[PDB]
Ligand binder design. Sequence first.
Ligand SMILES: *[C@@H]1O[C@H](CO)[C@@H](O[C@@H]2O[C@H](CO)[C@@H](O[C@@H]3O[C@H](CO)[C@@H](O)[C@H](O)[C@@H]3O)[C@H](O)[C@H]2NC(C)=O)[C@H](O)[C@H]1NC(C)=O
Ligand SMILES: *[C@@H]1O[C@H](CO)[C@@H](O[C@@H]2O[C@H](CO)[C@@H](O)[C@H](O)[C@H]2NC(C)=O)[C@H](O)[C@H]1NC(C)=O
Ligand SMILES: N[C@@H](CCC(=O)N[C@@H](CCC(=O)O)C(=O)O)C(=O)O
Ligand SMILES: [Zn+2]
Length: 595
Amino acid sequence: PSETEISQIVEWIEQRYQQTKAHQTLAAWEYGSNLTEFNLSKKTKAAADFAEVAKAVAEELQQFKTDQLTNATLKRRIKKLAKLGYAALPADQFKELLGAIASMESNYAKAKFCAYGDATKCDLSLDPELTEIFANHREPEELKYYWVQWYNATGAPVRESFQKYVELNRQAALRNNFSSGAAVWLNEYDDSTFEQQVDDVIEQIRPLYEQLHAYVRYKLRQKYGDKLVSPTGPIPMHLLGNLWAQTWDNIADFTTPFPEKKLLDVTDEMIRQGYTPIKMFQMGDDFFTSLNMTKLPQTFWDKSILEKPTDGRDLVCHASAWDFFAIDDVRIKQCTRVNMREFFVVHHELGHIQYYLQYQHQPVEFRGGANPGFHEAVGDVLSLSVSTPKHLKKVGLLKDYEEDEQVKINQFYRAGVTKLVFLPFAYTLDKYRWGVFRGDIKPREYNCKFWEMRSRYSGVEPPVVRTEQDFDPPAKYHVSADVEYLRYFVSYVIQFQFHRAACALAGEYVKGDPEKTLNNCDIYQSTAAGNQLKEMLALGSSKPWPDAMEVLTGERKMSADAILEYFDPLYQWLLEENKRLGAHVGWTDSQKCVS
Ligand SMILES: *[C@@H]1O[C@H](CO)[C@@H](O[C@@H]2O[C@H](CO)[C@@H](O[C@@H]3O[C@H](CO)[C@@H](O)[C@H](O)[C@@H]3O)[C@H](O)[C@H]2NC(C)=O)[C@H](O)[C@H]1NC(C)=O
Ligand SMILES: *[C@@H]1O[C@H](CO)[C@@H](O[C@@H]2O[C@H](CO)[C@@H](O)[C@H](O)[C@H]2NC(C)=O)[C@H](O)[C@H]1NC(C)=O
Ligand SMILES: N[C@@H](CCC(=O)N[C@@H](CCC(=O)O)C(=O)O)C(=O)O
Ligand SMILES: [Zn+2]
């Protein structure tokens, strides 16, 4: 048969695949929104159904040579439709794997806690009570109690489900001709040197990260005292405003260089201006429309969940953005709260939605990111513009003020503790999981190799001694839910490449120009930038990701150049200020995990 004829076969296969994948997504949404055992059975049934379909599709497609085919687009449609992943397993083992994952995720989403000092109040959750305690409370013993409560409840109790998940994740990789689950994840980036590229970015980031780490540690020790914060050891992580210490934005003002100069937390103005969750999504919609990009369809507003329900049902509150593989059926589920942190999450998620809308005209197997990092980068690029004093003044969230060099340091500092510190964190999560998947990290050393890696690359440690009887990795959503995390590392690098290109197109960035830096660029209302961005996103997965990147940046590789430029003024200030203050840089290894 001619390629124009094979193209008719896959076209019929594509519609078959799309319909069962939609049915499966729909059942997953219902569980995600309403965690009942009944809804779990329907989720795995619909997943089992799709697994059958994908097996049949994969066999049906082995009847075409693909080495005498010429349309490259066509070869690519057949390869992506034939990629089974977990569906490669016999159905019994498939449902056993999904049940192991759901067992972890369910335990995470359903955890509840008694208040510090009040055993009669035991309805506290991660979202919102614990998140906000860590964000705003500066009492170490209270923070330590909740840290211990959280990890004891979401980590060790699911060790066995985790072990089962690892074993069958491996079986699925072998049945797909990969050496391990780690090769499967890395395959999504389509570059055999990609693991090395990530190590190279970590090494370029490290000197800057270590200067910032050193300043934060110095300030936390001045605030909390030397018995709590060692001047030379890793930072007790429960003091960094976040249960995983993945971003330290919540202690930015508490530790800022110039606390009596203008600060850039707009939470109080959001509250004071009567902001609501819906208003917050409306403003993110407006930013995308200002870029000549797709306005949110009405289906989004009808079916999205944008506040935590008040009816006591269990659900996954971890914010997510869903593509139902139809037309304009796109939804966010977010337990939104009215503060600046959540305002950026809004944009992150709406970037996922916008990507969905831009490539929904493609065949189903191209309806994804160019690689998983492109998907995570989209909304964060907007958040880079939204975070500038320029934009916050436009939208009225930041009152006017005299700008000087110290206000600019407070600004650079906030950005560093919000975004720069996350890269070592994101790196360690998949370096750890790759090690479990590959066998380099064995079950009897699961916990101390985790905390050892967190100490090596992030210089943070638990507030109490942990042991191998603890098992702490699943205390992080993406571990319990089996969501690859390198996507966020890649995003945090390339999003600055995307931001630089979009600012250039908006006439907001000139290299070397003090009035047009990456740090003060706002691409709000730049249809010139939106148009080039639209083009990249409309590709979905139809081209190799270097070609998608070139569309917006003229470059074809991930590079830390952009992000090192963004943070160079902060880096120069820290180098001098740590020397002046006598702050130690670097850290001894943590002693907080015992084997
Ligand atoms: C969360 O998920 C549960 C399922 O696990 C939903 O439960 C379902 O609730 C509906 C009503 O809201 C029940 O419908 C009733 O069915 C009976 C007989 O089938 C009929 O006599 C009634 O007229 C009514 O239609 C349904 O039975 C029930 N399903 C199960 C399996 O118990 C629940 O509604 C969900 N909650 C939210 C807020 O979506
Ligand atoms: C906003 O985007 C639309 C496409 O979604 C642009 O429409 C194109 O406009 C050019 C004008 O040079 C035409 O040649 C194309 O045929 C149009 N295509 C479509 C699909 O409409 C529109 O130009 C963009 N607006 C701005 C201000 O950039
Ligand atoms: N860096 C953040 C991002 C996590 C987040 O908020 N949402 C996820 C949901 C993904 C999914 O459920 O498949 C997403 O939007 O990517 C963190 O670690 O908290
Ligand atoms: Zn995301």
